């Protein structure tokens, strides 16, 4: 009966994440014109979180009953999930790089920090996320396990290599490179500043949310009795990760003063 409890939890996440992201977008688009470069990345991060938010109801209706939406929806929902993951993971790296460039290279910062750079980098990030997601979708489809429908990805013994390729692609692209960029930037920023906390907290949260998922995926790729606890681990890690979209608006409303100035009014 755990599926019902998981569905209720997904509904809770849906409601809170939708409210938070809607409020963030509302403030950014009504009480400001995104004049600052910092605001464009926040807007794109909120638009990425909404992609996670939109995939919850299908999962809730899948835990109860079964998958009745067909194959096109089976591909599209997974596309939403993976594009959201990749885009939200890259935008944090962009924020970290921007903060480093300001704190350390302030003299040269004035030239780069313009609206055009933000727009171009955001478009590039979105295209990169979509391209990185394309390989996964081609294998998702609907299957009938004796009359019960399910949306899942199936590989033959010939195409099985792409499963390993995609697992390692996810790992290296979405964890190591972002983590390395954070490591390089924030040691220097702390060195300069100790003698801001917002983006540091953002990265640590968004890394601890996804690191168990990446670790379990790494173990799964290496494997390809351990199966049962590995399946339980990946299942729990999915929920562990899901909360990043809900908490990002929480962080931005808690820390940023600009958010408070326009949230207290409403």
């Amino acid at each position, epitope marked *: 009966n755990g599926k019902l409890l998981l569905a209720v939890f997904y509904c809770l996440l849906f409601v809170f994440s939708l409210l938070g992201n809607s409020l963030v977008i509302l403030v950014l688009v009504v009480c400001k014109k995104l004049r600052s470069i910092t605001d464009v990345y926040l807007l794109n991060l909120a638009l990425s979180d909404l992609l996670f938010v939109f995939s919850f109801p299908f999962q809730t209706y899948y835990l109860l009953d079964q998958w*009745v939406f*067909g*194959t096109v929806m089976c591909k599209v929902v997974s596309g939403f999930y993976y594009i959201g993951f990749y885009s939200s993971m890259f935008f944090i790296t962009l924020m970290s790089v921007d903060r480093y460039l300001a704190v350390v290279h302030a003299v040269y910062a004035l030239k780069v920090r313009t609206i055009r750079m933000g727009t171009t980098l955001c478009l590039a990030v979105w295209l990169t996320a979509i391209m990185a997601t394309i390989p996964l979708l081609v294998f998702y*489809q*609907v*299957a*009938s*396990e*004796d*009359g*019960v*429908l399910q949306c899942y990805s*199936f590989y*033959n*013994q010939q195409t099985l290599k792409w499963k390993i390729f995609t697992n390692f692609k996810m790992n290296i692209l979405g964890l190591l490179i972002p983590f390395t960029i954070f490591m390089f930037c924030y040691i220097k920023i702390l060195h300069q500043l100790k003698r801001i906390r917002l983006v540091l907290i953002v990265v640590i949260a968004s890394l601890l949310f996804w690191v168990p998922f990446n670790v379990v995926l790494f173990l799964t790729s290496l494997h390809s009795s351990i199966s049962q606890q590995l399946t339980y681990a990946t299942h729990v890690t999915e929920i562990i990760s899901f909360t990043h979209c809900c908490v990002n608006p929480v962080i931005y409303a808690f820390v940023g003063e600009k958010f408070k100035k326009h949230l207290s009014e409403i």
Partner: antibody
Amino acid sequence: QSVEESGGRLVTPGTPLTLTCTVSGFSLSNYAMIWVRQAPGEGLEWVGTISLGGYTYYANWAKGRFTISKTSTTVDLKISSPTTEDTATYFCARARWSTDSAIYTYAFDPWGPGTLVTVSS
Amino acid sequence: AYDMTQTPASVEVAVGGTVTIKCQASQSISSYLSWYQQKPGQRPELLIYKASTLASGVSSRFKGSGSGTQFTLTISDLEAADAATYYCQQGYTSSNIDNIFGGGTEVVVKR
């Protein structure tokens, strides 16, 4: 669960034919449907398959001569231009395990009482 | 591509004997073979799917084994009602396929 075939007839060589397979007890959106043919005194010969979403797959010899369609309750197999070698008993089966792309589509149960088609002048 | 060949075309066996029927695929299939039985003048009936698991309602005298390329079906305690034709069917793929069924093996009960 039950499947019943209809449409067996004596048809001159060249005029199109159409057979129907009516279903009772289960929904077609959940299972795939298989068409098979057996010549008198010979082994089974798969002709075509229709999956959950309505994607048709045909045997190499059957590409271009047969067409399968589905509806809420019935599954139709149309023979565009039968020849004298198309005389046989046609069976309609349900695949219990199947995939939308027709991989892993092994277990066929239940079968139907085949319908006999004859072509001659 | 995947050509299914059944080795014995016809096997004669006495009642209370063991019957072995062999099926083979040109290319490896990861244990996705099903077995069907057809008595004369009747529709086929499923016996085994996934090459090992019995279909509900079928006796325990039928045992399927094998994986990869070779496959086998064994009838342990033959009865006079077991005279029929058995077909092996591969559920691996349906693209560029001439026929998913085998040639069919006929069991004739000795007397």
